[PDB]
């Protein structure tokens, strides 16, 4: 199988950081050859599960989410969508490519938006436990208020990954809106932190995502019993987890963007997965 030779003295991306200081790749266009990666993942018959919550009104976001995932997400690989919803009948029946399936998991609806967002960790954890284990190799956990606009593939796959929050990738850490109160399990001292990861897109092997979600859930319970809610809820706890358990890949903001709020800067060669306007 024949492709351009990587040249040691002529890096493709010179404008951005492409590896973290613990040697995890930062995934940007021009750092990867998808043909090589597709072959590596196909030879293992990799199955990717994608979890998405659509509780109450967010069922309205599923049709575009799913149609655009069919176009752009892991195309050519085996995919299992897990749609968590309080309204199984409102899931649109989208036609899927071969080797792709969708399961609907009915769950309860929490009243507050915070708890719906926060209780995802518990629900991914869940107990949807020996089920994710037998069914898929990797789990990808995303917001439903989104659409795919370009390739999201096996380049993201790794034991544990997070995604750079699009409104903080160019900032310094004291500007990061981590939880700064030490009463919270989510507390990160002001002199600490690598990146600000966004809550809408994380994943990894099933064992690592279960660890993560179990820890974030146990940490959120400790805070509740202590009468505190972290400033950005699950995102706060995700950031704390990924500080202490560093991801083995970091996705660039190509993988989580909002063209309406942020435009299309030159540093972004593709906008792959983006926010859909809402109230």
Ligand X SMILES: O=c1ccn([C@@H]2O[C@H](COP(=O)(O)OP(=O)(O)O)[C@@H](O)[C@H]2O)c(=O)[nH]1
Q: Which residues contact 33 (CB under 8 A, 6 or more apart)?
A: 3, 4
Note whether 143 binds Mn ion by CB under 5 A.
yes
Looking at beta carbons, which residue is closest to ligand X?
A: 143
* Residue 116 interacting entry, from Mn ion, ligand GAL, ligand X, none, C-beta within 5 to 8 Å by type: ligand X
Q: Which 8-state DSSP code applies to residue 268?
A: -
Comparing CB distances to ligand GAL, the nearer of 210 and 236 is 236
Give the per-residue SS3 of 107-150: CCCCCCHHHHHHHHHHHHHCCCHHHHHHHCCEEEEECCCEEECC
Which entry of 70, 122, 235, 254 is annotated as an active-site residue?
Answer: 235
Q: Residue 242 interacts with ligand GAL (CB under 6 A)?
A: no
CA 241 – CA 140 distance, rounded (Å): 16
Q: Which stretch binds Mn ion (CB under 5 A): 66-74, 94-102, 141-149, 167-175?
A: 141-149
- Is residue 234 part of the contact set for ligand GAL (CB under 6 A)? yes
Overall size of the chain counted in residues? 279
* Binding site residues, ligand X, CB under 6 A: 53-56, 58, 113, 116-117, 143-145, 200
Cα-to-chain-centroid distance, residue 71: 18
Check if 192 is active-site.
no
- Quick check: 198 binds ligand GAL (CB under 6 A)? yes
Helical pair 233-244 and 206-225, crossing angle rounded to 10 deg: 120
Rounded distance between C-alpha atoms, residue 213 and residue 135, angstroms: 18
Assess contact for 254 and 272: CB atoms under 8 A.
yes
Interface with Mn ion includes 234 (CB under 5 A)? no
Compare residues 46 and 117 and give the one whose CB is closer to ligand GAL: 117
Least Cβ distance, residue 143 to ligand X (angstroms): 3
Asked if residue 155 binds Mn ion (CB under 5 A), the reply is: no
Please, is 226 exposed, middle or buried when counting C-beta atoms within 10 Å of its C-beta (0-12, 13-18, 19+)?
exposed
| In the complex, least distance from residue 113 CB atom to ligand GAL, rounded to whole angstroms | 9
| Among Mn ion, ligand X, ligand GAL, none, residue 230 binds (CB under 5-8 Å by kind) | none
Q: Is 144 annotated as a binding residue?
A: yes
SS3 15: coil
Binding site for UDP-N-acetyl-alpha-D-galactosamine, residues? 53-55, 58, 143-145
Which residues are tagged catalytic? 235
The site for ligand GAL (CB under 6 A) is made up of 117, 143, 165, 167, 177, 198-200, 232-235
């Amino acid at each position: 199988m024949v492709y351009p030779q990587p040249k040691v003295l002529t890096p493709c991306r010179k404008d951005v950081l492409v590896v973290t200081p613990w040697l995890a790749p930062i995934v940007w266009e021009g750092t990867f050859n998808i043909d090589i990666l597709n072959e590596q993942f196909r030879l293992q018959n990799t199955t990717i599960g994608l979890t998405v919550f659509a509780i109450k009104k967010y069922v309205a976001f599923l049709k575009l989410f799913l149609e655009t995932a069919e176009k752009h997400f892991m195309v050519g690989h085996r995919v299992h969508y897990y749609v968590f919803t309080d309204q199984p009948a409102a899931v649109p029946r989208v036609t899927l490519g071969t080797g792709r399936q969708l399961s609907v998991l009915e769950v309860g609806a929490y009243k507050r938006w915070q708890d719906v967002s926060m209780r995802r960790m518990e629900m991914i954890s869940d107990f949807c436990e020996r089920r994710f284990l037998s069914e898929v190799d990797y789990l990808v956990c995303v917001d439903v208020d989104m659409e795919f606009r370009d390739h999201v593939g096996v380049e993201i796959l790794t034991p544990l990954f997070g995604t750079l929050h699009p409104s903080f990738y160019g900032s310094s850490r004291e500007a990061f809106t981590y939880e700064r109160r030490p009463q919270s399990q989510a507390y990160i001292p002001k002199d600490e932190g690598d990146f600000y990861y966004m809550g809408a897109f994380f994943g990894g092997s099933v064992q690592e995502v279960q660890r993560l979600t179990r820890a974030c859930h146990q940490a959120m319970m400790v805070d509740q019993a202590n009468g505190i809610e972290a400033v950005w809820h699950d995102e706060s706890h995700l950031n704390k987890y990924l500080l202490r358990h560093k991801p083995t890949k970091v996705l660039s903001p190509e993988y989580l963007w909002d063209q309406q709020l942020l435009g299309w800067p030159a540093v972004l060669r593709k906008l792959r997965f983006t926010a859909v306007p809402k109230n």
